[PDB]
Amino acid sequence: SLPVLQKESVFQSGAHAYRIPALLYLPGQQSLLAFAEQRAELIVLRRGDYDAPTHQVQWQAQEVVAQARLDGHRSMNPCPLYDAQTGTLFLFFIAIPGQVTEQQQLQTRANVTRLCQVTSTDHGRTWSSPRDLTDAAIGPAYREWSTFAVGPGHCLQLNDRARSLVVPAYAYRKLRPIPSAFCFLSHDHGRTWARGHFVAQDTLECQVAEVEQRVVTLNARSHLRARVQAQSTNDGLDFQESQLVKKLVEPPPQGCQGSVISFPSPRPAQWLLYTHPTHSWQRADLGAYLNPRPPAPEAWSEPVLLAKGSCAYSDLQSMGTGPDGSPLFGCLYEANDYEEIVFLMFTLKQAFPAEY
Ligand SMILES: CC(=O)N[C@H]1[C@H]([C@H](O)[C@H](O)CO)OC(C(=O)O)=C[C@@H]1NC(=N)N
């Protein structure tokens, strides 16, 4: 394990069970928003204020994102998104009928999953009513899908003309059900939602990052022994290029979700950071990977050990300049056989004292 600034558990599986973390930074108020699935069942949230003096994050009391649900459906895969332009907070998620499951939908081929979002204009303190965007965003294609999902994890807003909203997703499309990664795009600040195109075969949960002319790189889990990296030159509408990244291992089963963010290069305008279990055959040993010449896959560094032991899902968030003057990061990840979601806060200089 690497020397960090903070390591506290934001969610602990005691009187309840938590999974599928989601982190979101608010640069204006230097606050983090920690989302997670509670039991699926509901989506909880926990705001934690970053205190500069102690180089700490004081986490407030958690709460149930109540409106983030649909009667008779259970909520899953929280995907927070902050529109800097309008200062609107978006929380996407997936709603599934009562006890129905993924395998039930995959085997039955009867998609019943629902794409939703709630928004907050006072920083997730209170939320708008749920807006079911299924039909409008997916359209006819919905009948060709056995099921689909968003995130989990932070979404992405672009620096293009419209400051477009990008939401990573994947779906089991028919051709027998094959999963593919794609993005839901909004060029009107969430007003309306189009649906981008798919990547090469077999790609599940994924996250997107931007980098500078302007390409959106996607990192998705696969059933292969590695991660798949797709690049879009038309803002996520199409991901023309797609490669398997050998250095980015994926545990045996069907892989494990991962997280990728972009941040200000110390010297391309950005660099990429990526967290994922590094262990060879099991979900353990969460590692951090650095790409100093993005999107070049062969530019991916070796992982740096973040946490030894059982580590599954994760979500990263850039948090501006850290104490040592280098980039500061916030990492939300599942640990100890899903008995808790641990928060980690460290700097570039702390994780990669060489490439700095
Ligand atoms: C919606 C849903 O069923 N999400 C699954 C996810 C999913 O099965 C894979 O990405 C591909 O099907 O896998 C895993 C997983 O641990 O591999 C947990 C997620 N669980 C929850 N979000 N509750």
UniProtKB/Swiss-Prot annotation:
GO terms for biological process: ganglioside catabolic process; glycoprotein catabolic process; glycosphingolipid catabolic process; oligosaccharide catabolic process. Exo-alpha-sialidase that catalyzes the hydrolytic cleavage of the terminal sialic acid (N-acetylneuraminic acid, Neu5Ac) of a glycan moiety in the catabolism of glycolipids, glycoproteins and oligosacharides. Recognizes sialyl linkage positions of the glycan moiety as well as the supramolecular organization of the sialoglycoconjugate. Displays preference for alpha-(2->3)-sialylated GD1a and GT1B gangliosides over alpha-(2->8)-sialylated GD1b, in both monomeric forms and micelles. Hydrolyzes monomeric GM1 ganglioside, but has no activity toward the miscellar form. Its EC number is 3.2.1.18. This is Sialidase-2. It is found in: Cytoplasm, Cytosol. It holds the Pfam family BNR_2. Substrate binds at residues 19, 39, 170, 172, 205, 221, 283.
